[PDB]
Each structure stands twice: as structure tokens, then as C-alpha cells.
Amino acid sequence: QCVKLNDGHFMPVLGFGTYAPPEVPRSKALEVTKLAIEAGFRHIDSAHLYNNEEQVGLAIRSKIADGSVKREDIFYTSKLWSTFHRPELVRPALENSLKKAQLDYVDLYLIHSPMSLKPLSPTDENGKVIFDIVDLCTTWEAMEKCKDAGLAKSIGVSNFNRRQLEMILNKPGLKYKPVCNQVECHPYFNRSKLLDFCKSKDIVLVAYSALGSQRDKRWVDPNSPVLLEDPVLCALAKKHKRTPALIALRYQLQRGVVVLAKSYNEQRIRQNVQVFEFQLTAEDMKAIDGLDRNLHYFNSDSFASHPNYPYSD
Numbered sequence: 001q002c003v004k005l006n007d008g009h010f011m012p013v014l015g016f017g018t019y020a021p022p023e024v025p026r027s028k029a030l031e032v033t034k035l036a037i038e039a040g041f042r043h044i045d046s047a048h049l050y051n052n053e054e055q056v057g058l059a060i061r062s063k064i065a066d067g068s069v070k071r072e073d074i075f076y077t078s079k080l081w082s083t084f085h086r087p088e089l090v091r092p093a094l095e096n097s098l099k100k101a102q103l104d105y106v107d108l109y110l111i112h113s114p115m116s117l118k119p120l121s122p123t124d125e126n127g128k129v130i131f132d133i134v135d136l137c138t139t140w141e142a143m144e145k146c147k148d149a150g151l152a153k154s155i156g157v158s159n160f161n162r163r164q165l166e167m168i169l170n171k172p173g174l175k176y177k178p179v180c181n182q183v184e185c186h187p188y189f190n191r192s193k194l195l196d197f198c199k200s201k202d203i204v205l206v207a208y209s210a211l212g213s214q215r216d217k218r219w220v221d222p223n224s225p226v227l228l229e230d231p232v233l234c235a236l237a238k239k240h241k242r243t244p245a246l247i248a249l250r251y252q253l254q255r256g257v258v259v260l261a262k263s264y265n266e267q268r269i270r271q272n273v274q275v276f277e278f279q280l281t282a283e284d285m286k287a288i289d290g291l292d293r294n295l296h297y298f299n300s301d302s303f304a305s306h307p308n309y310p311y312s313d
């Protein structure tokens with residue numbers, strides 16, 4: 001249930017998404033991350049942005065303390081937020097994440113986004129987001145030093161487009177390739193071409209919003225189609241006697257995509273590990289590939305006007 005990364009470490013192919021909006025109490029992240037670990041998740045996805053690293057790290061330490069897992073059985077990810085791109089800010093941000101979780105290292109540290117912000121959402125007096133210009137090759141060199149230090153076992157990026165990934169791959173004296181690019185990916189935005197490019201470079205694509213996103217009104221149009229109501233996914237859930245969420249997760253695994261799944265619901269957290277219990281046929285995969293429609297749920301002025309907006313290409 002693992003994939004081997006390009007630096008030789010292993011990443012579990014199903015991960016637990018931990019983000020929940022500020023209206024959910026912080027204590028819920030502790031409880032649901034324990035439940036996820038109990039259910040069998042071994043890859044846990046967090047970030048500075050999520051304001052939950054203390055609770056998530058406590059859930060992991062608690063499951064280590066009670067004998068359920070060892071540290072080495074857990075793959076924990078955190079992410080550099082975009083106000084900390086300046087290379088001198090990278091290691092201190094990572095050390096702050098580690099102190100919050102009370103862990104000695106993360107399994108994976110990512111650049112959360114290429115869209116640099118003034119050193120969470122800095123805004124000018126009108127309401128406009130304040131951007132920054134940073135050479136992300138320098139950010140990347142700071143990430144590589146964090147791996148050399150043992151602060152992160154592996155390092156990768158998120159929300160990069162092909163051009164952005166090439167800039168890092170082509171960097172003079174690159175030491176470590178990104179292990180992964182974590183991006184929005186689901187059957188209405190399946191990233192087929194980006195996935196090919198990643199496979200060609202032995203980089204793993206990690207899908208977020210694989211179940212169609214939380215549809216948070218801050219970034220998602222509530223008029224957008226609801227992925228888990230899709231009629232093809234419904235028809236395939238009835239064929240397999242599973243659920244449309246499980247169809248959408250299994251689709252990713254069969255394409256060689258590592259897939260995240262957030263749920264703060266006890267039943268759905270346990271449901272999602274059923275993804276390993278069945279498989280889809282080629283005609284089933286073809287039907288899901290046919291749903292692709294260039295639909296990114298995160299679709300906001302706060303991204304689309306950024307000079308480094310990943311969806312410009």
C-alpha cells in the first residue's frame with residue numbers, strides 16, 4: 001500500500017486530509033486523526049496553513065504512545081506557507097511546524113503553493129491580497145538543506161504546473177528532485193497531461209480535492225457541479241456496490257496517483273480505506289476519464305490574478 005519515492009523513501013498511497021474550516025473546533029482534528037489511524041490510514045496530510053499541527057501531531061504521538069503504530073509506520077506531511085518563500089524563512093518555518101507537532105522530523109515537507117505572498121493572507125487597505133516576488137529556485141535550495149539536516153525525510157511541491165516543475169528540475173546544481181507534486185485532481189479535472197509529465201520524471205502526483213473539495217465559499221463557487229453526485233460515478237458505485245467517493249478514490253490509485261481523502265465523519269473515515277478492497281475495469285476507467293471537464297474547484301480572484309497562478313498555462 002506504498003509507493004517508492006525518487007529519494008528511496010516510501011509513501012503510503014492513501015492519505016488522510018486534515019484541513020477543516022475555522023468553524024470546526026481545533027479539538028476535532030485530534031479526534032479524527034486518531035480515528036483515521038485506527039481505520040488504517042498511515043499517511044497524514046497537514047500544513048502550517050491549517051492551524052492544526054498541534055492536534056494532528058498529538059494524534060500521531062498518542063497512537064504511538066498507546067502501541068498502535070511506531071513513528072516509522074506513519075508518513076506525516078507538512079507544508080511551507082507562501083509568506084515564507086524567502087529562503088532564510090524556510091528552515092525556521094519547518095522547525096516551527098515540528099515544534100507545533102512535537103515531532104523530530106516530517107516525512108515530507110512541501111512548498112504549499114508557487115504563489116508567493118508578502119512575508120496568512122496579507123491584504124492592503126482595499127481588501128486586495130499582497131503578493132511577493134521570490135525566486136523559487138532559492139526556496140528550493142533551502143528545502144534541500146532541510147532534507148540534508150534531517151528535518152524532512154523527503155521534499156516536494158504543491159500546486160505547481162509543468163513549467164514551474166521544470167524550472168526546479170532544470171535548476172543549475174539541483175541536489176534533490178521534488179518527490180511529488182500535490183495538486184487538485186479528480187474526475188472533473190484529472191490532470192492527465194501533468195500526470196504523464198510527472199510519471200516521465202519519476203515524480204508522484206498527489207491528488208487533493210479528490211472527492212470534489214469541501215466547497216468552501218471562500219474559494220469555491222457553490223454553483224459548481226457536486227462531484228459525488230455525478231451520474232457516472234453513481235452508476236459505477238451501484239455496479240460495484242460501493243459509493244461514489246470510493247469510485248473516485250480507486251480511480252486515482254489505478255492511475256498511479258497517490259490520493260488524499262478528508263473526512264471528519266467517523267463512518268466515512270472508515271469507509272474510505274475500503275478503496276483497497278475492490279478494483280475497476282478498463283471500461284470503468286474509461287468512463288471516469290470521460291468526465292474530465294477542466295473544472296478546478298478552487299477558483300478565486302485571490303489566486304487567478306497572481307503573477308505565478310498555476311492555472312495560467
Ligand SMILES: NC(=O)c1ccc[n+]([C@@H]2O[C@H](COP(=O)([O-])OP(=O)(O)OC[C@H]3O[C@@H](n4cnc5c(N)ncnc54)[C@H](OP(=O)(O)O)[C@@H]3O)[C@@H](O)[C@H]2O)c1
Binds near residue numbers: 045046211214243
Ligand atoms: N496542497 C493544497 O493546496 C491543498 C488544497 C486542498 C486540499 N489539500 C489537502 O487535501 C485534503 C483533501 O482535500 P479536500 O479538503 O479538498 O477534501 P476532499 O478529500 O475532496 O473531501 C471533500 C468532502 O468529501 C467528504 N467525504 C469524505 N469521504 C466521503 C465519503 N466516503 N462519502 C461521502 N463524502 C465523503 C468530506 O466531508 P465529511 O468530512 O463530512 O466526511 C469532505 O469534506 C485537504 O484536507 C488537505 O489535506 C491540499
Ligand SMILES: O=C(O)c1cccc(Oc2ccccc2)c1
Binds near residue numbers: 019
Ligand atoms: O491546503 C488546503 O487544504 C487549502 C485549504 C484552504 C485554502 C487553500 O488555499 C490554496 C489553494 C490552492 C492553492 C493555493 C492556496 C488550501
